[PDB]
Ligand binder design. Structure first.
Ligand code: ADP
Lengths: 511, 259, 132, 147
């Protein structure tokens, strides 16, 4: 039972566990891997996840969600003031630490945002535990890259309230890069652009990865751009339509609008795989059955500026990172809203047709990375490296035929693998343009008595007297015994290779 | 293209020898200075004092922790202490070369009696002779002498203190403890340790009486053109900065013993 | 009435080592006591997140240092959770035997006294300079 | 808050300057500072300062190993942070705070650890980037170069 990582968002969250080289992303009670960052305080119990989201229209005044905007902030913080004007619940200046007042079991208790998010984390904890069949406290929680230190501590504390051992707080874009394997090494010295288009926010972050070591070069964003306003444009389409079609002003009924919005969310998600989606609500407003539709093209028109504006922070991030388009090697998507074809088309066209990394569901990639990181942090073994080195060795020395018909070993018998070993060779005779390397396995001095594994030619060698050209021959062996023998001439940079397949007295006298 | 080979068969492994190679020969002795005159030391003492205070700066910096003092204070201390360091330096050489009867401006220059008693010499030099006489009467060892020269270095400060004074104070107290040790391990017995210590310390304290008069000569000849006295750039800067503070009582004399 | 208790052997030995072993880094004295006060302050702060009443006795969570040279004393005040009679008796609230034993083994292996807090027995370092 | 745990964009040059003076016991200001952070497989933050001066002792008397302070998860470990940077760079004064280093510190643990190997590798490339930034605006590069 491995450590887990939790993707703690403003509108949604997701938990995964890392094991057997992969992260298993875990479904909630209804089969949903990603569930809402909502807690509904009712007079009987607090519902968490889909259960809270499903009743926002009925109990919005007591349902608390998007705790993150308030977490780690002071009551007087302009952000706090900006968001409290948008909530159905009351935000309270309890010592400049904004609390939310909702009725729980009949009492108008003020709940601090860290406990609201711990309620969410506790639910995510329970989801992963039910799946894994084991209680789990070892965890990584992700946060936006822009979070400051009061916010990071606040996130750790929400974890502690929930009973978690917070191994670490890591950034959302780091986790995505991890999820896509950009930290597996051999992919170093690359720039990664992460496009984080979520529910209530949009962020862009440019990372540089050097063989597993990360640096963040730049960030940019729009703190109010995300799926929620794509939903609001779809809502205005349907709300104004309803009113005009029926001469009934639905916009004034918070529940009817929320039912319409829920349909907007469903239709929009459907629309992203489709070309068309519909709205079908019985008795939506004043007993009126509202049946209508949205096409993909209409959706894009409604939201045409919301989509185009996502590239403005892209240009900003590139400016801050001092990078041109050509300097981004890896294009990465984060957030369910990037599943809309228009987003993919805009980012991909912006970067001249280059393919986006869509290999992991955008809403799972962050949790995925957190889970991988949680597993290494709980104890630093992650399908490597010491077992590979101690269990698998080169069973026979590995080397090459050299002049004289003899074998020169570069990898010694029973040496641990994976490993890379080298030696310097020159052409045997004078003024040759290249060399012939015969790769062998075995313990005999002569090559005629060894196992020929394969042969290759190293070209690009300036002719010079014997012993002058400097050729480095490398025996590069992986964990499974596969051998790659390469060679290069250090004076020209030219190289070639062969792939070898796997087997698996006087002093006592006087005068 | 030809089969490769481990050529030339001349690839050395000198690694164990490279580990062995470490030593080099290092040398002592870094600079040198002398006066070029005798009765005219009335002006050449300043050229010498310039070179000696500069040497005193190099010397002072060589003492661990001195370079960590604020530069403004490092220079303030040589600006005020150069005079006692000079008289004391003459003192040691005089003590050993002329039985403290003559001042020894450099290892290669001793000014004899026929010049020593001339007013252009003696009005300043009689105070420097006091110092030589005391090292001789006191029978000061070279270790004890160096401890005292080192103490004089930090002995004259502004009445308002030093910018980085706390480090100066730690250094100066380390030095007085060193003088005590130099004496205790040489005289033997107990009564002779305190008598040699306090008698040598009294010279360090009386060096300020020597400095008051030696500086007044320099201050007077620096400002009064009637005297026809030339100064090097080093002392000229020190003296213009030192006169308005020393003659007005704005500089504190630090003593290591009471009367 | 004053109750007298024995120290558990692992810590009776630890305190002997602290006093008699010639450790030069006496400054860890203050470092460890301040650090331990921080832990106590967090214990309340975390409980106050689900049970705010823990702060009803005093909302301020802080560390005070108050020397009084005339009595050869220093007071360190931890406004954190504190200890009940039972915790004071039970090794000032820690797992003294497992922590200290592992630490003594670490010391036998060459560990410095500065590592005492890494075993959760950091407060015994008070005796580096304390008589009492 | 520790200056190195603060956000480099918010910290002013005056703040870095006074910090530096206190860090180094240098009344003169810093020439340049590189403030950066690293995440992923190894988390740390660091401040590397190039002093305005190279005042002699650096080549003879200074215990240069004490130029950079080491912290682990903000816990001070030591001043003599031998092998954080190669000798040629021992003129840089600074602070390195490594979140992922163990506190069970001895020279042997550090020397044989891949963490120290990585910290040194990365502190060095960052130093070189700072020098490159100084190379631009040659009017100031030469001030550096001269010493
Ligand atoms: N196929 C889709 N098309 C359009 N929007 C989607 C799709 N799938 C998910 N979404 C939206 O993505 C959002 C999920 O955001 P996520 O990145 O998980 O959370 P957060 O923004 O809180 O970090 C929701 O607002 C949801 O409606």
């Amino acid at each position: 039972a491995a450590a887990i990582g939790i993707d703690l968002g403003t509108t949604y969250s997701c938990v995964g566990v890392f094991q057997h080289g992969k992260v298993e992303i875990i479904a909630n009670d209804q089969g949903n891997r990603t569930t809402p960052s909502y807690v509904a305080f009712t007079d009987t119990e607090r519902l968490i996840g889909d259960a809270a989201k499903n009743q926002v229209a009925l109990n919005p005044q007591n349902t608390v969600f998007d705790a993150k905007r308030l977490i780690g902030r002071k009551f007087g913080d302009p952000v706090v003031q900006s968001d409290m004007k948008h909530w159905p619940f009351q935000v309270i200046n309890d010592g400049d630490k904004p609390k939310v007042q909702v009725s729980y079991k009949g009492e108008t208790k003020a709940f601090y945002p860290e406990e609201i998010s711990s309620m969410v984390l506790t639910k995510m904890k329970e989801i992963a535990e039910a799946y894994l069949g084991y209680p789990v406290t070892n965890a990584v929680i992700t946060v936006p890259a822009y979070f400051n230190d009061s916010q990071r501590q606040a996130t750790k504390d929400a974890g502690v309230i929930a009973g978690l051992n917070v191994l670490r707080i890591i950034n959302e874009p780091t986790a995505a890069a991890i999820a896509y394997g950009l930290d597996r090494t051999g992919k170093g010295e690359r720039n990664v652009l992460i496009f984080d288009l979520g529910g209530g926010t949009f962020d862009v972050s440019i990372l540089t990865i050097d063989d597993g070591i990360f640096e963040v070069k730049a960030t940019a964003g729009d703190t109010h751009l995300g799926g929620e306003d794509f939903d609001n444009r779809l809502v205005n389409h349907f709300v104004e339509e309803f009113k005009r079609k029926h001469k009934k002003d639905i916009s004034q009924n918070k529940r009817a609008v929320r039912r319409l919005r829920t349909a907007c969310e469903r239709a929009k998600r459907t629309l992203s795989s489709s070309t068309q989606a519909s709205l079908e609500i019985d008795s939506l407003f004043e007993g009126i059955d509202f049946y209508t539709s949205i096409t993909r093209a209409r959706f894009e028109e409604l939201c045409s500026d919301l989509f185009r504006s996502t590239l403005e922070p892209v240009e900003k991030a590139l400016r801050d990172a001092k990078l041109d388009k050509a300097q981004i090697h890896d294009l990465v998507l984060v957030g369910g809203s990037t599943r809309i074809p228009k987003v993919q088309k805009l980012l991909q066209d912006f970067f001249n047709g280059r393919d986006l990394n869509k290999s992991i569901n955008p809403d799972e990639a962050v949790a995925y990375g957190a889970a991988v990181q949680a597993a290494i942090l709980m104890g630093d073994k992650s399908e490597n490296v010491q077992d590979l080195l101690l269990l698998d060795v080169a069973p026979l020395s590995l080397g090459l035929e050299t002049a004289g018909g003899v074998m020169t070993a570069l990898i010694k018998r029973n040496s641990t693998i994976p490993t890379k070993q080298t030696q310097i060779f020159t052409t045997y005779s004078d003024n040759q343009p290249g060399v012939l390397i015969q790769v062998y396995e075995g313990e005999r001095a002569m090559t005629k008595d060894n196992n020929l594994l394969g042969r290759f030619e190293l070209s690009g060698i300036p002719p010079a007297p014997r012993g002058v050209p400097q050729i480095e021959v490398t025996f590069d062996i992986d964990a499974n015994g596969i051998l790659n023998v390469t060679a290069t001439d250090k004076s020209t940079g030219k190289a070639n290779k062969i792939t070898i397949t796997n087997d698996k007295p006087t002093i006592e006298e006087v005068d | 293209s030809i089969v490769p080979a481990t050529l030339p068969q001349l690839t050395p492994t000198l690694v164990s020898l490279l580990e062995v190679i470490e030593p080099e020969v290092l040398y002592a002795g870094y600079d040198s200075s002398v006066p070029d005159s005798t009765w005219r030391i009335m002006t050449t003492l300043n050229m010498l004092g310039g070179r000696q205070v500069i040497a005193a700066v190099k010397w002072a910096k060589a003492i661990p922790g001195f370079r960590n003092l604020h530069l403004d204070d490092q220079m303030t201390l040589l600006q005020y202490s150069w005079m006692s360091l000079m008289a004391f330096a003459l003192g040691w050489r005089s003590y050993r070369q002329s039985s403290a009867n003559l001042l020894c401006f450099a290892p290669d220059l001793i000014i004899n009696e026929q010049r020593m008693t001339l007013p252009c010499m003696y009005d300043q030099c009689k105070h420097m002779l006091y110092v030589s006489s005391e090292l001789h009467r006191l029978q000061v060892s070279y270790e004890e002498y160096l401890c005292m020269k080192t103490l004089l270095l930090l002995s004259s400060v502004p009445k308002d203190g030093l910018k980085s004074q706390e480090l100066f104070d730690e250094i100066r107290m380390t030095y007085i403890k060193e003088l005590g040790k130099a004496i205790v391990k040489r005289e033997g017995n107990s009564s002779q340790n305190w008598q040699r210590f306090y008698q040598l310390t009294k010279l360090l304290d009386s060096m300020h009486e020597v400095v008051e008069n030696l500086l007044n000569y320099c201050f007077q000849t620096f400002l009064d053109k009637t005297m026809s006295i030339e100064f090097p750039e080093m002392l000229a800067e020190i003296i213009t900065n030192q006169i308005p503070k020393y003659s007005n009582g704005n500089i504190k004399k630090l003593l290591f013993h009471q009367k | 009435e004053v109750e007298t208790f024995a120290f558990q052997a692992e810590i009776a030995q630890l305190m002997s080592l602290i006093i008699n072993t010639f450790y030069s880094n006496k400054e860890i004295f203050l470092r460890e006591l301040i650090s331990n006060s921080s832990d106590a302050l967090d214990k309340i702060r975390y409980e106050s997140l689900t049970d705010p009443s823990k702060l009803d006795s005093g909302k301020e969570l802080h560390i005070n240092l108050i020397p009084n040279k005339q009595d050869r004393t220093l007071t360190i005040v931890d406004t954190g959770i504190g200890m009940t009679k039972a915790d004071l008796i039970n090794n000032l609230g820690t797992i003294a035997k497992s922590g200290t034993k592992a630490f003594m083994e670490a010391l036998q292996a060459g560990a410095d006294i500065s590592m005492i807090g890494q075993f959760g027995v950091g407060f015994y370092s008070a005796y580096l300079v304390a008589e009492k | 808050k520790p200056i190195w745990t603060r956000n480099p964009d918010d910290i002013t040059n005056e703040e870095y300057g006074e910090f530096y003076k206190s860090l180094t016991n240098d009344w003169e200001d810093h020439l340049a500072v590189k403030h950066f952070s690293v995440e992923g497989q190894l988390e740390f933050r660091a401040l590397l300062f190039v002093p305005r001066r190279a005042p002699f002792d650096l080549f003879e008397n200074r215990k240069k190993k004490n130029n950079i302070k080491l912290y682990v998860r903000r816990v001070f470990i030591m001043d003599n942070c031998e092998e954080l940077i190669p000798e040629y760079l021992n003129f840089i004064r600074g602070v390195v705070d490594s979140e992922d280093l163990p506190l069970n510190i001895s020279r042997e643990m550090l020397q044989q650890s891949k963490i120290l190997k990585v910290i040194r590798k990365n502190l060095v490339k960052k130093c070189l980037e700072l020098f490159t930034e100084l190379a631009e605006d040659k009017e100031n590069y030469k001030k550096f170069y001269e010493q």
